[PDB]
Design a protein around this ligand. Structure first.
Ligand SMILES: CCCCCCCCCCCCCCCCCC(=O)OC[C@H](COP(=O)([O-])OCC(O)COP(=O)([O-])OC[C@@H](COC(=O)CCCCCCCCCCCCCCCCC)OC(=O)CCCCCCCCCCCCCCCCC)OC(=O)CCCCCCCCCCCCCCCCC
Ligand SMILES: CCCCCCCCCCCCCCCCCC(=O)OC[C@H](COP(=O)([O-])OCC(O)COP(=O)([O-])OC[C@@H](COC(=O)CCCCCCCCCCCCCCCCC)OC(=O)CCCCCCCCCCCCCCCCC)OC(=O)CCCCCCCCCCCCCCCCC
Ligand SMILES: CCCCCCCCCCCCCCCCC[C@@H](O)O[C@H](CO[C@H](O)CCCCCCCCCCCCCCC)COP(=O)(O)OCC[N+](C)(C)C
Ligand SMILES: CCCCCCCCCCCCCCCCC[C@@H](O)O[C@H](CO[C@H](O)CCCCCCCCCCCCCCC)COP(=O)(O)OCC[N+](C)(C)C
Ligand SMILES: CCCCCCCCCCCCCCCCC[C@@H](O)O[C@H](CO[C@H](O)CCCCCCCCCCCCCCC)COP(=O)(O)OCC[N+](C)(C)C
Ligand SMILES: CCCCCCCC/C=C\CCCCCCCC(=O)OC[C@H](COP(=O)(O)OCCN)OC(=O)CCCCCCC/C=C\CCCCCCCC
Ligand SMILES: CCCCCCCC/C=C\CCCCCCCC(=O)OC[C@H](COP(=O)(O)OCCN)OC(=O)CCCCCCC/C=C\CCCCCCCC
Ligand SMILES: CCCCCCCC/C=C\CCCCCCCC(=O)OC[C@H](COP(=O)(O)OCCN)OC(=O)CCCCCCC/C=C\CCCCCCCC
Ligand SMILES: CCCCCCCC/C=C\CCCCCCCC(=O)O[C@H](COC(=O)CCCCCCC/C=C/CCCCCCCC)COP(=O)(O)OCCN
Lengths: 175, 64, 303, 104, 56, 121, 459, 53, 57
């Protein structure tokens, strides 16, 4: 379906076997789905065509909102409230986008687990690794801010982590 | 009416500070609080120490 | 396209129409039980088709149709699981329930509130079908609580009897004792696996720790009336015989066991919890049979 | 319609007020026994036997057959604990200690 | 009957009048907070050919 | 701020001449409306105390109450605004005349300031 | 925001000028219309807030509370219209005036862009409630209850004011936006400890905390039906709103100072749930249930996590609706019985089946049956507490068990069994009472369809 | 009121966030970037205080 | 016994409200119980004047 892009939500080529009736008995499944088609699928399809023509008679569009980039909290003065407000709003928008990214990855993981069936442990290692990476990044960004989280607290946590990383790297280099 | 009044409204005017009552009130009103405080404090110090040493394996722990 | 989903949702959907019509005029006539029985029989003969498709092909599905609230990275949606377990258990439950209402037609012939009795039976069936087909832990909890509340209402059917109310409260007490472990398992799974969906829970737990499995085992012991929390099942025989035949013998009381069946990928990776489950089952079956072999009430012996 | 004197009071220390309290609660002076005078505020309320309401006679014509209570008779301090839906003290065929030992 | 039911039903007009007056007063308070109209870095915009203010 | 000894203050002047350089409060000022409302409430209480129909006993008396309240409120608002203007003028003049006690802080960005982080656990 | 305040103010002139037999109809109609108007505030943003002006602002924490406050007034009028039948027109208009003043004060309190204005309105809500309790009350103890309900509150609230002004001397602004954007950590000092206590105990006393819950049973029992409704539904949520608004500046000192209150709430929920089991009064039992639920809300707020705040908001809304319904049902029983004792009138399901259904639904929604929003809030708070510490689950599960026990005990004692023989004045339930129950219960089952509407700003 | 609340416009920016995440993931996957970065801010514009201890 | 009567009805009542009521009643009785003899009040005023002269300088 064109409603969503295949690249963000990838799917395998979905190969399926062909029917190989080894006996002459008529299986009830084929006849059952034929009568199901005749009794359900055709009226639903016809109603959909009627509704789609009615929608085509009146066509209108909506646009995805675009947002400009604004200086973040790192380029804001200590007591300047306007730039702090702009940076806080931008940080909240980025936080929401990151949450949606993690949601997309989790959707991929769930779909892979359901699709691959009994061999989910092996055939979905790539999705598990992707989710591990994205979850590690998300946790590093926003694990312990808690309620009343803010851009300043996130920046302080990042500064603490980078100070620790710099100290560890300096110790390892001079070890 | 006598039953309800004696159950609800006649308790305090007949109350007397007694070693039995003082000890029982202190126990049942203070002991559980300090017990649960000690339990939760010990658990949280253990968890904080494990986090500081980094040996807790908090992978996939995103919602809190 | 792919009638498996349409049929497997249509069965549960048409199971709910008499509840909608309970406010109509037919609820005030004596044809309401026949209406409910016919609806259940049609639901069973309609659910016989997904079973045939599964037996032919082995076809399994997940239907996440409606999107509920999304909480940061956790997404909650109305998702139904149609694996082997659901598509096999639904026809059997519908067949048993059809037989039970046909029997209750004659057994409850002199009860003034027979339409209400049939409505209660249908509501219990709907809640159990919700429990069986649930794909996430919140929907499973919804079914878990619906079946318990319906059991409470049906045990105390004769509310003028003190013992019926006592038995209903006993059942509620024991089921809440199990609810403690159920909620513990839910909280642990959300905190560590970051989801309540079955797929993500199975994926992120290669070697499941003790605590969530112990919570699941406690919930299963509470609902299935194991040795620690057994007496509520014997005491539930205060309700009408159709209630004892449908809920407390064949459909509701297996629910806890079904729960442990649903989490079997995590069950096999833990040895201590398996030993606890085996020991609890053995002691429960021994004690209950030993109590049974000397009872005088027939309903108690069957329970 | 209830007067001030028909409400519970403090612990009775002399036989005169004991008789007055026994008259207040519709019982004989010999049958009257207040709770021991300790800090807990029982005041002057009859310490009826701790027997439950399940083992009251189920064939007597009580004014409240479900609760097995009469209209004007005194009510046990822990009546809500003994309502045939809760803890009952009915004697059992085997002694309590024997059942405890066997179960343990 | 007009001029008779009014003496009894005139109280029903108070709340809607209060509502419309409150909307007018909300616009009143809004008109005094335009010091940054079309000036935020996020929504810096060039005016339309027949536009004077972005929002009122 | 004790302005009793402020230099060049006429002793018993309610409104000095310099106060005329400030914008007068509008006749629709919410504070004037509240003063009129207070006058109306006083009229209603006067009607209630004397055992008269509260809403429609004296229209002239209530309207006089409202008018007097509005008059006094207008003049009080004028004086209040003048006093606040004087306070701000004095504060700004003192800040200007004493630069050494009000130094210009060095402007620093949050990217170069180390703030301790306290995790919520 | 004045589009809501001005109609509420115009409700007063309308009531006074209203005909002697048309006060209730006009009040109910216009209150429902004002609730419909206030429904528009639910449309919130993922951004900061709905800043209407310098004085009033809206938020997705304030919006559900404002909607509930506007919705409660018609229900309060419908409940109060019964027992005020033999009452003079002037005093009935005074009662409606007290209700309108309380609603106006609550509406202005929930916006309150500045903390001193919030305190002023938060303490102004006290006077109408005290007047209602001490004037239109039945028992002789009402006066005492009023005294309690007053002084407890002030005993917590007077230090807060001092702290508030002190903050304005140090920070320079008590505006919530500036306070949030310019928040700085609190050093672990004795002075900061006492400022924390002054800021916290004012809201902890009104929840109420387990130690400071004495005033609540008295105030709820001796108040009339409208007073009980407003106390249980909205007035208890002021402390939670204040705590969620004020805990921003209390960090990181909250981590150390939360322990005594966390222990007190976690044990007092069990204590009050057990107290509910042995209770000979319906109103007292409902009051203690309210205490337990608000103790859970206190635990949620002290944990200070996003899931904690979401569950707290949902639980406050659900508990308000549920407690109002329970008090209404108890008052409907009392108006027929005039005894207010559980064991006196029994077997009411035989005589009043639809009211028995209402009782069952109220008990089920108080029992936290999924997927009700009560269960959503309880589960969110439980999960947040488990993340805080894995041992809390024992106390939480015990609380759930005892809650179910006492809820079904309340239902069974009054509805099931055999009817009392000597009681013969049990008339069929009126349309007004049934409509009150339906208007109480339908919003809950509609809100469970859209939970995000009541999950707060951290959703 | 129920119908009005049900059809409230998406001011919470749920679909907007979903579409932004879709396009952002589409960009990063094609460019080979490692999805979400660990640092919320660019370290180049953060000036650490040198210890020299 | 413990939850309802011992703590809720007795000790929690004894600690905050009842102690405050008793202390305030005692202090009010002590302060207000003046027989109206100006001799005692004048002697107290003299003592206060002496204390102020010998303590606040
Ligand atoms: C189940 C599918 C339903 C589909 C049909 C839609 C039905 C809509 C009903 C909405 C709720 C009713 C309104 C509440 C007030 C009751 C009105 C009344 O007075 O009755 C008069 C009327 C006439 O009776 P009468 O003979 O004149 O009077 C005799 C006496 O009154 C004597 O009275 P009685 O003895 O006959 O008792 C009345 C009866 C009914 O009265 C009640 O007690 C109603 C209480 C229902 C819920 C209780 C609160 C718990 C929180 C649940 C919140 C979920 C809400 C979802 C959204 C709802 C939208 C509003 O009580 C019960 O039967 C016990 C019900 C307990 C069931 C426990 C299971 C709960 C969870 C179930 C799953 C829900 C989500 C599914 C998600 C997964 C699947 C998609 O009776 C009825 O109309 C009965 C209503 C039908 C039963 C409803 C029970 C299940 C519905 C759950 C909520 C809706 C689910 C939505 C889709 C689910 C799929
Ligand atoms: C946030 C601010 C916003 C809200 C503002 C709130 C305050 C505003 C008003 C302030 C005071 C001014 C008016 C009060 C005068 C008192 C007169 C009175 O008693 O009422 C009787 C009178 C009707 O009775 P009547 O036929 O004359 O003869 C009966 C006798 O008067 C007397 O009959 P009776 O003696 O036989 O009855 C005995 C009764 C009579 O005793 C009383 O009623 C005394 C009146 C209350 C005391 C007032 C104290 C001063 C104000 C303090 C406000 C406190 C606010 C802070 C919140 C805490 C609340 C305490 O006393 C008792 O029953 C004893 C127990 C009472 C319960 C305990 C006491 C609690 C009272 C506290 C009330 C506080 C709010 C008052 C609201 C207004 C009430 C009228 O009521 C009225 O008609 C006047 C009401 C206002 C007139 C509205 C006209 C405007 C409509 C057209 C213009 C449209 C405007 C918009 C323009 C654009 C449209 C196109
Ligand atoms: C309880 C509410 C207040 C009510 C007050 C009574 C209202 C009726 C009074 C009628 C008018 C009185 C004004 C007098 C006319 C001229 C006054 C003028 O000559 O005096 C000047 C000063 O004017 C008066 O002081 C102002 C009086 C106005 C009082 C209103 C303030 C009320 C406080 C806020 C509550 C709001 C009340 C609003 C409703 C009334 C010069 O003072 P100055 O010789 O240089 O120094 C002496 C004062 N010092 C020492 C403190 C510096
Ligand atoms: C009654 C119903 C409930 C009502 C509300 C009750 C809740 C209020 C209780 C307030 C919490 C405790 C207050 C102070 C807690 C601080 C932590 C302290 O307990 O720990 C030690 C504190 O040591 C000792 O506790 C010293 C204080 C001892 C004096 C307090 C009296 C103890 C019992 C009195 C209880 C009465 C409270 C109610 C009064 C009306 C740590 O030693 P230290 O590292 O050095 O100090 C750290 C703090 N610094 C950095 C600011 C210096
Ligand atoms: C008597 C027996 C029954 C007979 C009747 C049979 C019919 C049964 C049907 C009734 C229940 C069955 C479930 C069917 C639900 C379908 C409707 C549902 O999908 O709509 C919900 C809508 O419900 C509302 O969202 C919730 C109700 C609003 C709550 C406000 C309460 C009303 C105000 C009153 C005052 C408030 C007091 C409390 C203060 C907070 C969720 O919609 P959503 O998936 O999201 O998106 C809507 C479409 N979009 C995408 C275009 C936006
Ligand atoms: C019925 C009469 C009309 C019959 C003709 C119409 C046939 C179907 C055509 C309708 C169009 C499809 C439609 O309804 O829209 C989907 C619409 C929601 O829109 P979405 O965008 O997909 O999700 C919300 C986020 N925006 O879905 C619906 O609301 C209808 C179906 C939803 C499921 C039915 C509700 C049953 C469950 C009730 C809630 C139960 C409690 C919560 C569940 C807990 C699960 C953990
Ligand atoms: C832990 C839970 C602690 C116990 C909670 C006590 C609650 C007390 C208040 C309940 C109200 C009183 C009440 O319900 O009445 C008693 C009522 C009446 O008795 P009947 O036998 O039905 O008599 C009828 C014939 N005339 O009986 C009850 O329902 C009370 C049930 C209490 C059970 C408590 C013991 C449970 C302990 C379980 C431990 C084992 C757990 C199993 C481990 C599984 C791990 C995989
Ligand atoms: C420094 C000084 C601090 C002062 C603190 C004042 C606390 C406010 C309450 C003051 C009440 C004092 C008066 C009093 O109690 O009198 C006893 C009085 C006797 O009754 P009467 O009506 O006067 O006469 C009956 C005989 N005809 O007893 C009562 O009735 C009291 C009933 C209501 C009590 C009010 C609740 C007070 C306790 C709440 C907490 C406040 C405690 C104080 C602050 C705590 C420290 C942070
Ligand atoms: C329901 C009843 C609850 C009662 C609530 C009472 C708890 C609140 C704490 C007591 C009142 C303190 C109010 C202080 C207001 C905040 C101001 C502040 O914190 O500033 C401090 C001031 O701190 C204080 O002075 C507090 C001293 C306390 C005096 C009053 C004692 C009252 C009783 C104390 C014992 C009770 C403690 C726990 C009470 C819990 C309630 C049960 C800094 O002072 P500076 O001189 O400016 O610092 C300069 C050097 N850095």
């Amino acid at each position: 379906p064109d409603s969503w892009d295949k690249d963000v939500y990838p799917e395998p080529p979905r190969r399926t076997p062909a029917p190989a009736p080894q006996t002459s008995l008529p299986n009830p499944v084929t006849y059952l789905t034929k009568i199901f088609d005749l009794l359900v699928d055709r009226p639903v399809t016809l109603a959909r065509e009627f509704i789609e023509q009615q929608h085509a008679k009146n066509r209108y569009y909506y646009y995805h909102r675009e947002f400009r980039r604004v200086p973040d909290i790192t380029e804001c003065e200590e007591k300047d409230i306007l730039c702090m407000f702009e940076a806080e709003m931008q940080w909240r928008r980025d936080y929401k986008v990151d949450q949606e990214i993690v949601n997309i990855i989790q959707e991929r993981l769930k779909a892979c687990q359901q699709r691959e069936g009994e061999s989910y442990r092996q055939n979905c290692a790539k999705e598990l690794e992707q989710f591990t990476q994205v979850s590690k990044a998300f946790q590093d960004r926003y694990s312990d801010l808690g309620a009343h989280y803010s851009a300043r607290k996130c920046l302080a946590k990042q500064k603490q982590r980078m100070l620790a990383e710099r100290k560890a790297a300096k110790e390892a280099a001079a070890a | 009416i006598r039953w309800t009044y004696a159950r609800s409204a006649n308790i305090y005017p007949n109350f007397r500070p007694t070693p039995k009552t003082s000890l029982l009130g202190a126990l049942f009103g203070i002991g559980p609080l300090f017990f649960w405080y000690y339990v939760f404090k010990t658990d949280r110090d253990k968890k904080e120490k494990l986090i500081q040493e980094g040996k807790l394996d908090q992978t996939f722990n995103i919602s809190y | 396209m792919n009638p498996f989903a349409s049929l497997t949702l249509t069965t549960l959907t048409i199971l709910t129409i008499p509840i909608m019509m309970s406010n109509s005029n037919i609820y005030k006539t004596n044809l309401y039980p026949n209406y409910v029985k016919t609806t259940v029989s049609y639901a069973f003969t309609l659910s016989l088709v997904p079973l045939l498709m599964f037996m032919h092909t082995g076809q399994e599905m997940i239907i996440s149709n409606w999107h509920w609230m999304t909480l940061q990275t956790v997404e909650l949606s109305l998702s139904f699981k149609m694996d082997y377990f659901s598509v096999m258990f639904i026809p059997v439950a519908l067949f048993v329930t059809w037989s039970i209402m046909e029997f209750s037609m004659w057994y409850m012939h002199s009860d003034p509130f027979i339409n209400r009795f049939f409505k209660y039976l249908l509501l219990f069936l709907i809640t159990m079908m919700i429990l069986v087909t649930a794909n996430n832990l919140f929907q499973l909890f919804i079914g878990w609580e619906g079946v318990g509340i319906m059991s409470f209402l049906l045990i105390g059917w004769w509310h003028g009897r003190t013992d019926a109310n006592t038995a209903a409260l006993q059942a509620i007490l024991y089921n809440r004792i199990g609810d403690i472990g159920f909620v513990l398992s839910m909280a642990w799974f959300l905190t560590h696996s970051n989801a309540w969906d079955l797929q993500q829970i199975f994926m992120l737990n290669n070697e499941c720790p003790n605590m969530p499995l112990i919570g699941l085992l406690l919930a299963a012991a509470g609902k299935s009336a194991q040795f620690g929390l057994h007496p509520w099942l014997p005491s539930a025989m205060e309700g009408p015989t159709p209630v004892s035949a449908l809920l407390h013998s064949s459909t509701m009381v297996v629910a806890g066991v079904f729960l442990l069946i649903r989490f079997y990928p995590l069950m096999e990776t833990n040895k201590l919890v398996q030993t606890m489950t085996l020991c609890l089952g053995a002691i429960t079956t021994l004690f209950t049979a030993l109590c049974a072999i000397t009872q005088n009430d027939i309903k108690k012996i069957v329970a | 319609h209830v007067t001030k004197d028909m409400f519970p009071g403090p612990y009775p220390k002399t036989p005169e007020e004991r008789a007055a309290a026994a008259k207040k609660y519709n019982m004989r002076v010999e049958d009257y026994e207040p709770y021991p005078d300790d800090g807990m505020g029982y005041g002057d309320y009859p310490k009826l036997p701790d027997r439950s309401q399940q083992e009251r006679d189920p064939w007597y014509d009580w004014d409240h057959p479900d609760l097995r209570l009469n209209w004007g008779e005194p009510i046990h301090w822990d009546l809500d604990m003994y309502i045939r839906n809760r803890v009952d003290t009915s004697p059992t065929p085997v002694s309590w200690n024997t059942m405890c030992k066997h179960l343990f | 009957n007009v001029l008779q039911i009014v003496r009894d039903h005139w109280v029903h007009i108070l709340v809607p009048v209060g509502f419309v007056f409150g909307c007018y007063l909300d616009r009143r308070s809004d008109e005094k907070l335009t010091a940054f109209r079309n000036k935020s870095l996020l929504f810096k915009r060039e005016l339309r050919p027949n536009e004077e203010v972005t929002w009122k | 701020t004790m302005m009793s000894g402020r230099p060049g203050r006429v002793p018993l002047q309610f409104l000095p001449n310099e106060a005329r350089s400030l914008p007068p409060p509008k006749l629709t000022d919410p504070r004037l409306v509240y003063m009129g409302f207070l006058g109306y409430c006083s009229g209603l209480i006067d009607n209630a105390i004397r055992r008269r129909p509260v809403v429609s006993a004296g229209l002239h008396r209530q309207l006089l109450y409202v008018t007097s309240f509005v008059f006094f409120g207008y003049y009080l608002l004028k004086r209040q605004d003048y006093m606040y203007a004087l306070r701000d003028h004095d504060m700004f003049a003192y800040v200007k005349s004493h630069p050494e006690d009000f130094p210009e802080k060095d402007k620093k960005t949050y990217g170069e300031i180390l703030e301790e982080f306290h995790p919520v656990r | 925001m004045l589009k809501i305040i001005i109609p509420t103010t115009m409700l007063l002139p309308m009531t006074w000028m209203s005909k002697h037999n048309m006060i209730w109809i006009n009040a109910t109609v216009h209150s429902l219309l004002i609730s419909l108007i206030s429904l528009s505030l639910l449309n919130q943003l993922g951004e900061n807030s709905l800043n209407f002006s310098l004085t009033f602002f809206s938020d997705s924490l304030s919006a559900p509370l404002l909607v509930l406050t506007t919705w409660l007034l018609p229900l309060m009028l419908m409940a109060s219209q019964s027992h005020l039948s033999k009452e003079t027109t002037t005093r009935k208009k005074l009662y409606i005036t007290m209700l309108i003043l309380l609603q106006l004060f609550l509406i202005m309190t929930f916006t309150a862009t500045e903390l001193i204005l919030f305190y002023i309105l938060f303490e102004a809500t006290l006077v109408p409630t005290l007047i209602i309790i001490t004037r239109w009350g039945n028992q002789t103890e009402r006066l005492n209850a009023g005294l309690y309900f007053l002084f407890y509150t002030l005993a917590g609230s007077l230090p807060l004011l001092v702290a508030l002004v002190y903050i304005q001397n140090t920070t320079g602004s008590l505006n919530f936006l500036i306070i949030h954007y310019w928040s700085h950590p609190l050093s672990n000092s004795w002075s900061n400890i006492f400022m924390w206590l002054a800021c916290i105990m004012a809201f902890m006393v009104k929840m109420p905390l387990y130690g400071l819950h004495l005033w609540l049973p008295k105030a709820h029992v001796e108040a009339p039906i409208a007073g009980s409704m407003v106390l249980a539904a909205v007035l208890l949520k002021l402390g939670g709103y204040g705590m969620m608004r004020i805990t921003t500046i209390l960090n990181p000192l909250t981590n150390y100072m939360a322990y005594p209150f966390l222990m007190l709430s976690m044990w007092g929920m069990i204590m009050t749930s057990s107290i509910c089991l042995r209770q000979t009064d319906l109103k007292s039992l409902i009051a203690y249930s309210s205490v337990s639920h608000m103790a859970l809300v206190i635990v949620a707020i002290m944990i200070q996590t996003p899931w904690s705040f979401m569950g707290a908001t949902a639980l406050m809304i659900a508990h308000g609706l549920t407690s109002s319904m329970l008090f209404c049902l108890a008052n409907t029983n009392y108006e027929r019985v005039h005894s207010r004792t559980m064991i006196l009138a029994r077997g009411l399901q035989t005589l009043l089946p639809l009211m028995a259904t209402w009782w069952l639904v109220a008990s089920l929604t108080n029992l936290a049956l999924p997927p009700s929003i009560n269960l959503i809030g309880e589960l969110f708070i439980i999960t947040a507490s488990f993340s805080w510490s894995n041992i809390t689950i024992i106390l939480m599960g015990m609380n759930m068990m005892i809650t179910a026990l006492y809820s079904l005990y309340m239902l069974i004692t009054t509805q099931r069994g055999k009817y009392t023989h000597h009681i013969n004045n049990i008339k069929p339930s009126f349309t007004r009472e049934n409509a009150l129950m339906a208007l109480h219960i339908l919003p809950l089952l509609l809100l469970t369809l859209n939970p995000k509407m009541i999950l707060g700003p951290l959703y | 009121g129920s119908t009005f609340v049900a059809y409230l416009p998406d001011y919470r920016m749920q679909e907007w966030a979903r579409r932004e995440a879709e396009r952002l993931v589409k960009y990063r996957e094609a460019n080979g970037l490692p999805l979400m970065e660990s640092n919320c801010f660019d370290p180049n514009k953060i000036q650490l205080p040198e210890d020299e201890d | 016994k413990s939850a309802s009567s011992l703590l809720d009805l007795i000790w929690l009542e004894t600690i905050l409200p009842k102690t405050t009521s008793f202390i305030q009643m005692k202090m009010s009785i002590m302060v207000s119980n003046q027989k109206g003899l100006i001799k005692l009040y004048f002697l107290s005023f003299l003592i206060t004047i002496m204390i102020s002269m010998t303590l606040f300088n």
